[PDB]
Write a protein that binds this ligand. Structure first.
Ligand SMILES: Nc1ncnc2c1ncn2[C@@H]1O[C@H](COP(=O)(O)OP(=O)(O)O)[C@@H](O)[C@H]1O
Ligand SMILES: Nc1ncnc2c1ncn2[C@@H]1O[C@H](COP(=O)(O)OP(=O)(O)O)[C@@H](O)[C@H]1O
Lengths: 69, 364, 194, 48
């Protein structure tokens, strides 16, 4: 709400993605979106930096050895 | 010019040098106004009974209900504020900044050494990222306010020891020219049960009192550790400490202008609550240098050493794989040492070769 | 040229009289700064232009808007100070105090060695000399190179091979204060031996 | 008594720890002499 306009990004689809993320993670996703927008010097977020922020926050990197699963 | 040789032959000495005893009179006047002082009792305000009557407890002594001086900002005399009392009339004489813990004092009054940003090398992406996350909220907060986000509260730098996370944070502090608490975790742990959490509380209380501030806690892997059940008394005590750190970062009381930097070699063992965003919004991989990063470290660390004729870096780079940053600075220092074994006032290329050879053997 | 002569006369009169007033000031200074001072441990110095809070030896903690009748630049946070018995102003500062273990940490300042006590470690003592005292006296040749001197030597070997004797020998030949910090003792004594 | 603080007739002062009361820094008396006063023995100090 306090964010800038998202130029019609699929926020509802981002919500629809099944991911075990807390409200803190959503706040982090938005915060990362703001940081990326500042870094590339554009005040209006779009799907590119929002998507990069989403991948960064919810990375959930495992690399786990295959024999476990 | 009959009696005006330089100045009257006598005024040259009477005007200034025999007026040194006027500065001595000035010193005596300072002594006099120090004589007139009587010193003051110091205590902490406990409660505001009314607009004038304040409950004040003197340190290691009794408590009183006391008034305050006629001209004073009553609106700031909060409960717990260290204050000074007149010894005789026992009135609020003047305010005092909150007493600083001795370990907090020694941890905060260590000179960073004003290290510039040039002396890092090969960390461009990570140094830019950390510069953003820490200093951008400390330079143009209105940019963050407009964008629509709250400034991130801190980040993590994880990597092998010797990768210069401490150096990078130390450089950030020097650039910002702000208050800097450089603490090392596992040094705030104590045998006494409730002392480590108290030390964390005091650290963050100083940080809030001295905004803007950057708390660099190294080896957070020590205090921060996936809280687990069972555990010896110590295991639990450390959990309690981590719990304080957590609440002291993202807890009821919001942090402002106090940005934290945490360095560790084992990020995997960190607690998920600590690893959760809000507390540590970013995790930065300060990994082992690449060839470009390696040569950058060598070139920035070869500056002070005096070189004669020819000194190349790519050979040392391809022949010195695995060195993080401390090994390379060791190479440079050992080359400087090799320089005086054969008694030069300079260095040579073969000197650098044999230095990096010795450092590599020590690495093995 | 006459007016400057009159000024010289007036300035010599001023000097002659304000000598007496400064001596009277000194007499009154001593009238306060008499003798029976009370020792206090300076907790810290605070900026106001410096103020210091102290803990007098009568278990009382006091604030001082002005730092007594003594200089206020060194004023280490812990330096014992002779504070007034009644008005509690720092008349003068005293030498430092024992810090427990360091007093227990015997100096043994005269180790009484001349390298004739150590035998069979000629290369080792040559290395020790060239590593500690040679840079100590040729630190100039070190800063000419633009590098820092070695801040600490290291040795290793089987127990009883003379590692402590060589240390004592170096302390003797350099007349340098010796502290015999223990290695296994420090692992104990609870958390705090850092 | 405690450190002599280099008396040598120029600084005739000593640190004395009056039991649980406090520590002080005090001069000599006309009766006593510097020679028989050093560090560590029991010194009878006055009350003013
Ligand atoms: N870019 C760099 N990466 C790693 N080490 C460096 C770099 N630049 C300089 N150094 C050297 O590494 C040391 C930094 O040590 P430190 O920051 O404590 O490493 P760590 O953060 O891994 O503990 C400095 O003394 C310096 O000589
Ligand atoms: N080369 C030597 N010449 C003479 N005495 C020696 C020599 N090496 C060891 N010692 C004797 O061994 C003792 C010192 O043992 P040292 O190895 O220094 O102690 P530690 O092994 O406990 O550090 C001294 O009494 C010393 O006289």
């Amino acid at each position: 709400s306090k964010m800038n306009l998202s130029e019609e990004v699929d926020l509802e689809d981002y919500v629809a993605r099944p991911d075990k993320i807390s409200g803190a993670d959503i706040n982090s996703i938005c915060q990362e979106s703001g940081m990326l927008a500042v870094r590339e010097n554009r005040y209006i977020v779009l799907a590119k930096d929002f998507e990069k922020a989403y991948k960064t926050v919810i990375k959930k990197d495992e690399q786990e050895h295959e024999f476990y699963k | 010019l009959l009696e005006h040789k330089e100045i009257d032959g006598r005024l040259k000495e009477l005007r200034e040098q025999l007026k040194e005893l006027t500065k001595q009179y000035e010193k005596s006047e300072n002594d006099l106004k120090a004589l007139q002082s009587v010193g003051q009792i110091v205590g902490e305000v406990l409660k505001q009974l009314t607009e004038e009557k304040f409950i004040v407890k003197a340190t290691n002594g009794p408590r009183y209900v006391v008034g305050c001086r006629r001209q004073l900002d009553k609106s700031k005399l909060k409960p717990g504020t260290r204050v000074a009392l007149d010894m005789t009339t026992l009135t609020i004489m003047r305010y005092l900044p909150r007493e600083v813990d001795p370990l907090v004092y020694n941890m905060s009054h260590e000179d960073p050494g004003n290290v510039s940003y040039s002396e890092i090398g090969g960390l461009s992406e990570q140094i830019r990222e950390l510069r953003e996350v820490i200093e951008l909220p400390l330079t143009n907060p209105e940019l963050f306010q407009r964008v629509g986000i709250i400034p991130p509260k801190g980040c993590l730098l994880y990597g092998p020891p010797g990768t210069g996370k401490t150096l990078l944070a130390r450089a950030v502090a020097s650039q910002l020219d702000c208050n800097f608490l450089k603490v090392v975790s596992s040094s705030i742990v104590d045998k006494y049960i409730g002392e480590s959490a108290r030390l964390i509380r005091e650290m963050f209380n100083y940080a809030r009192d001295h905004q803007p501030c950057i708390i660099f806690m190294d080896e957070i892997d020590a205090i921060g550790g996936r809280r687990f059940s069972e555990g010896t008394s110590a295991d639990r005590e450390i959990q309690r400490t981590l719990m304080e750190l957590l609440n002291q970062m993202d807890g009821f009381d919001t942090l402002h202008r106090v940005k934290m930097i945490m360095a560790t070699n084992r990020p995997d063992t960190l607690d998920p609550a600590l690893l959760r965003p809000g507390r540590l919004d970013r995790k930065i991989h300060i990994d082992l240098p690449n060839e470009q990063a390696r040569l950058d470290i060598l070139k920035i660390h070869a500056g002070p050493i005096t070189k004669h004729g020819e000194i190349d870096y790519e050979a040392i780079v391809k022949l010195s794989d695995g060195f993080n940053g401390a090994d390379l600075r060791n190479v440079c220092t050992e080359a400087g040492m090799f320089a005086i074994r054969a008694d030069h006032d300079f260095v040579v290329q073969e000197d650098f070769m044999k230095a990096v050879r010795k450092v590599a053997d020590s690495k093995k | 040229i006459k007016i400057m002569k009159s000024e010289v006369l007036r300035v010599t009169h001023e000097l002659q009289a304000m000598k007496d007033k400064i001596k009277e000031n000194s007499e009154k200074i001593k009238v306060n700064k008499t003798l029976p001072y009370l020792v206090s441990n300076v907790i810290e110095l605070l900026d106001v232009g410096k103020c210091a809070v102290i803990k007098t030896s009568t278990r009382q903690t006091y604030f001082l808007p002005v730092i007594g009748l003594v200089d206020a630049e060194k004023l280490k946070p812990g330096d014992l100070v002779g504070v007034n018995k009644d008005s509690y102003l720092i008349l003068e500062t005293l030498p430092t105090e024992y810090d427990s273990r360091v007093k227990a940490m015997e100096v043994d300042e005269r180790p009484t060695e001349q390298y004739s006590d150590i035998g069979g470690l000629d290369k080792q003592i040559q290395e020790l000399v060239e590593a500690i005292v040679l840079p100590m006296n040729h630190k100039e040749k070190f800063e000419n190179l633009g590098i820092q001197p070695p801040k600490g030597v290291l040795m290793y070997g089987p127990p009883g091979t003379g590692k402590t004797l060589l240390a004592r020998a170096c302390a003797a030949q350099t007349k340098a204060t010796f502290l015999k910090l223990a290695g296994p003792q420090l692992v104990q004594m609870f958390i705090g031996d850092g | 008594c405690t450190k002599i603080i280099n008396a040598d007739s120029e600084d005739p002062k000593y640190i004395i720890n009056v039991k649980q009361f406090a520590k002080f820094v005090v001069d000599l008396s006309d009766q006593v002499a510097p020679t028989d006063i050093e560090e560590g023995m029991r010194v009878g100090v006055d009350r003013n």
